[PDB]
């Protein structure tokens, strides 16, 4: 991009979740966050970086959402709780009322061009819908399709996800979008996605059958300590076998380590996680 | 003038989900509330599980301070199971969560910090914001403080690599657990981490700590407002040896003027005007409960309250520098005597005034930033090469532990109790939830609270300077919460 070039707005609304998406988005190499900042979007609301504060932010963004209506990215990092009438997640106060993330989602999902799902949360309940929460805590697209909402919905998961799954998304959507227009180009998104509403060139590829520990899981060599690099880490709790992901290609943090080298792999863009991928350290 | 009530919600560049209501009378603070306005519930989320899972799931708590959680975590699971951690994996864990107070130091004070003093350029997200934001620094020093936070962006990344080299990836580690560290450090990967650490080290050196006493002498208003009790926790962190009674911050309260030891059994969670049921008021954490009750009347925040002795005290690197009383950096001496004319060896010879304020707490954090190199170059000197770093420990049926350690925004324990091998009861009490909590069942204010009152507002209609103080305690509401 250049500083003089064209920028979509983006929002970015975080509901429950722990700033992990935006922190790893933060770590992207090539493009830097510096350039997507200045260069490939215009992130006009996020409540982590941004200048301004409380009513004043919550009503720029809502100047910006009307002059883009049907324009903006709406970028959710979170679970939308529903218990309580929505009082688990207050995002917001303007005019003197309170605004849920129920609420926000209402109101700003009929009008984005598309909703991004970052994270796992977002994607598909993630840590707050698990086991002994309370909350109702809801995935993006179950709650927008609850309520009525239509607005096209891409799931960027993981926990937290890698930087170039979301830069790359992004991407993909700009690219299809400079191609085909927004409503052509969002729907050779949806084309590219799989059954869980992820992108396929990041979560088209099985962890397991693309590991280096393959032949050692064949021959059933398996370290009994994580500090054993040589054998498979299956009998460890590794996941890989069922979990969609490029981290044995990409890695982590500017390629210096990952997951399955390191200890294991959890499952984290999996819909299942972490209930489906628990215990983490048994078979 | 008399009264204005002005609402913030949501309070931005901190983390998490804040609101803060202050009223002000004839242009100062006279009472605040922080509301934490978003609630997940790890602590009943955590039961019935496995309870090695927890090292997983507790670092979702926060995806800045992941490393703290997990570190806490574990040291809880090792003292229940009865783990030894080898030598070699306890200075691991020490280099992994170590970089980590490098990255969300210098995140804080450039990414969320920086723009209360800085201009940034003309686009999104540094524009609009108030028309009166009282940005007092020469086109050139701003203009330091862009390329700063600029680089900062790179610096804070590879402290990022740094995590990752033994810790898998970050956020969200996978290397440490019960028992020690899950990757031996390589000759090559401790070549990988030094190098990477010698561009942090000269970063914090030659830029981040001369940025904030030079911009701290164009606000040094801002030392004279903020100081709340003046009163402070540390719960130690960082073991230096295996004895688990030498620590790189030991540990003591400091309250009405006076050191203390700290014992952990006086920690209370007050509830009254917390989102709890009431009945779960008052417990220490071995007895903690986490029962929601969001429609509770009174009540404004989901964060417990709680309370050393009946003390409100904050935490951070103002609580952990102030505690231990460590020497200057070299460059603090210097511009503490060429900006401000003083005379100071030593931390607490800011004085206690200074020391607990607004721009003292930022400070603090870039001093407690330099304090860490030497922490990290020694255990670079320690750590052994190729020597094994994990035991592998049972599951017990029946256990209790309790992890203590220091987030980079304060004091965190984690408790676990274990019955029929799984999770019958954890508790957190975290950095943010001893600095952003509520009143307690007596009325008495949290320690962001108390800091607020006094702070000025001589506009109304650009009322910045209760947004700074807040910043300054580096608030994260994620973990204040959980
Ligand atoms: S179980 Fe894990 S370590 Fe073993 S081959 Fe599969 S992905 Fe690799
Ligand atoms: S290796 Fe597994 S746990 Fe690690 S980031 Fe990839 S999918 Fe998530
Ligand atoms: N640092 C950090 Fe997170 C907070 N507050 C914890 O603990
Ligand atoms: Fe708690
Ligand atoms: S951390
Ligand atoms: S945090």
Same mark, same amino acid.
């Given at each position: ?25 933060? +770590? ?76 926000? /989602? ?33 995935? #993006? ?13 891409? +799931? ?25 227009? /927004?409503?052509?180009? /969002?729907?050779?998104?949806?084309? #590219? ?63 210096? +380590?990952?997951?399955?080298? +390191? ?21 | ?14 983390? *998490? ?51 703290? %959680? ?7 699971? @090792? ?9 070699? *994996? ?28 800085? &201009? ?27 390329? &700063? ?63 904030? !006493? ?5 606000? $040094? @208003?801002?030392?004279?407002?903020? &100081? ?39 920690? $209370?969670? !007050? ?36 309370? !050393? ?35 100071? $060896? ?24 330099? !304090? ?17 770093? =994990? ?22 324990? %984690?408790?676990?109790? =274990?019955? @029929? ?18 009143? @307690? ?42």
């Amino acid at each position: 991009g250049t500083l003089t070039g064209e920028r979509p707005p983006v929002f970015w609304l975080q509901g429950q979740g722990c700033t992990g998406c935006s922190v790893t988005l933060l +770590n992207s190499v090539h493009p830097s966050i510096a350039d997507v900042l200045l260069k490939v979007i215009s992130l006009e609301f996020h409540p982590t970086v941004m200048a301004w504060e409380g009513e004043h932010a919550i009503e720029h963004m809502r100047k910006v959402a009307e002059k883009f209506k049907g324009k903006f990215f709406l970028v959710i990092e979170g679970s939308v709780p529903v218990e309580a009438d929505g009082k688990y997640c207050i995002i917001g106060e303007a005019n003197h009322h309170e605004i849920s993330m129920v609420d926000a /989602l209402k109101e700003f999902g009929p009008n984005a061009a598309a909703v991004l799902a970052v994270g796992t949360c977002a994607a598909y309940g993630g840590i707050p819908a698990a086991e002994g929460s309370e909350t109702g805590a809801t995935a #993006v697209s179950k709650f927008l399709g609850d309520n009525g909402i239509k607005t096209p919905v891409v +799931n960027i998961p993981g926990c937290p996800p890698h930087p170039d799954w979301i830069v790359g998304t992004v991407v993909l959507a700009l690219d299809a979008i400079k191609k085909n227009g /927004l409503e052509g180009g /969002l729907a050779e998104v949806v084309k #590219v996605l799989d059954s869980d509403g992820r992108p396929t060139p990041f979560f088209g590829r099985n962890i397991h059958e693309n590991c280096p520990y393959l032949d050692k899981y064949d021959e059933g060599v398996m370290s009994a300590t994580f500090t054993d690099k040589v054998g498979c880490r299956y009998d460890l709790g590794c996941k890989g076998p069922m979990t969609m992901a490029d981290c044995f290609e990409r890695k982590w943090n500017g390629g210096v +380590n990952w997951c399955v080298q +390191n200890a294991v792999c959890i499952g984290c863009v999996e819909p299942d996680f972490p209930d489906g991928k628990s215990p983490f350290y048994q078979a | 003038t008399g009264r204005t009530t002005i609402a913030i919600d949501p309070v931005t560049r901190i983390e *998490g989900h804040l609101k803060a209501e202050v009223v002000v009378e004839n242009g100062k603070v006279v009472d605040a509330r922080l509301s934490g306005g978003m609630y997940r519930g790890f602590e009943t989320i955590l039961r019935g599980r496995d309870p090695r899972d927890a090292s997983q799931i507790v670092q979702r708590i926060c995806g800045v301070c992941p490393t703290a %959680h997990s570190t806490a975590s574990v040291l809880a699971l @090792d003292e229940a199971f009865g783990a030894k951690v080898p030598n070699n *994996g306890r200075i691991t864990r020490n280099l992994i969560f170590g970089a980590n107070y490098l990255q969300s130091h210098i995140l804080h004070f450039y990414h969320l910090s920086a723009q209360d003093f800085v &201009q940034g350029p003309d686009t999104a997200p540094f524009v609009p914001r108030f028309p009166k934001s009282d940005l007092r620094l020469s086109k050139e020093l701003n203009k330091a403080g862009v390329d &700063q936070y600029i680089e900062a962006l790179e610096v804070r990344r590879i402290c990022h690599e740094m995590v990752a080299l033994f810790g898998g990836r970050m956020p969200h580690v996978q290397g440490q657990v019960v028992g020690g560290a899950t990757e031996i450090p390589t000759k090559e990967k401790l070549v990988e981490y030094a190098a990477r650490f010698k561009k942090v080290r000269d970063f914090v050196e030659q830029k981040y700590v001369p940025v904030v !006493y030079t911009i701290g002498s164009k606000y $040094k @208003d801002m030392f004279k407002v903020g &100081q709340g009790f003046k009163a402070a926790l540390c719960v130690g962190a960082f073991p230096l040896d295996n004895s688990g009674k030498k620590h790189l911050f030991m540990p003591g309260v400091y309250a009405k003027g006076k050191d203390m030891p700290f014992d952990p059994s006086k920690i $209370k969670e !007050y509830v009254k005007y917390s989102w709890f049921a009431e009945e779960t008021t008052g417990l220490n954490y071995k007895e903690g409960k986490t029962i929601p009750a969001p429609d509770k009347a009174g009540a404004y925040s989901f964060v417990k309250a709680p309370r !050393y002795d009946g003390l409100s005290l904050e935490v951070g690197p103002l609580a952990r520098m102030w505690v231990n009383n460590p020497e200057l950096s070299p460059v603090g001496k210097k511009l503490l005597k060429d900006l401000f004319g003083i005379s100071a $060896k030593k931390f607490r010879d800011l004085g206690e005034e200074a020391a607990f304020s607004l721009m003292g707490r930022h400070v603090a954090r870039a001093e407690e930033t330099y !304090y860490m190199l030497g922490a990290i170059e020694g255990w670079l000197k320690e750590i052994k090469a190729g020597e094994d770093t =994990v035991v592998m420990p049972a599951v017990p049926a029946s256990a209790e532990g309790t992890g203590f350690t220091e987030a980079p925004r304060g004091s965190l324990l %984690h408790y676990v109790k =274990v019955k @029929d091998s799984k999770i019958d009861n954890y508790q957190i009490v975290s950095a943010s939830l001893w600095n952003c909590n509520p009143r @307690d069942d007596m009325g008495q204010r949290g320690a962001v609270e108390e800091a607020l009152i006094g702070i000025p507002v001589d506009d109304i209609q650009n009322p910045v300077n209760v947004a700074r103080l807040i910043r300054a305690f580096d608030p994260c509401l994620g973990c204040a919460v959980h």
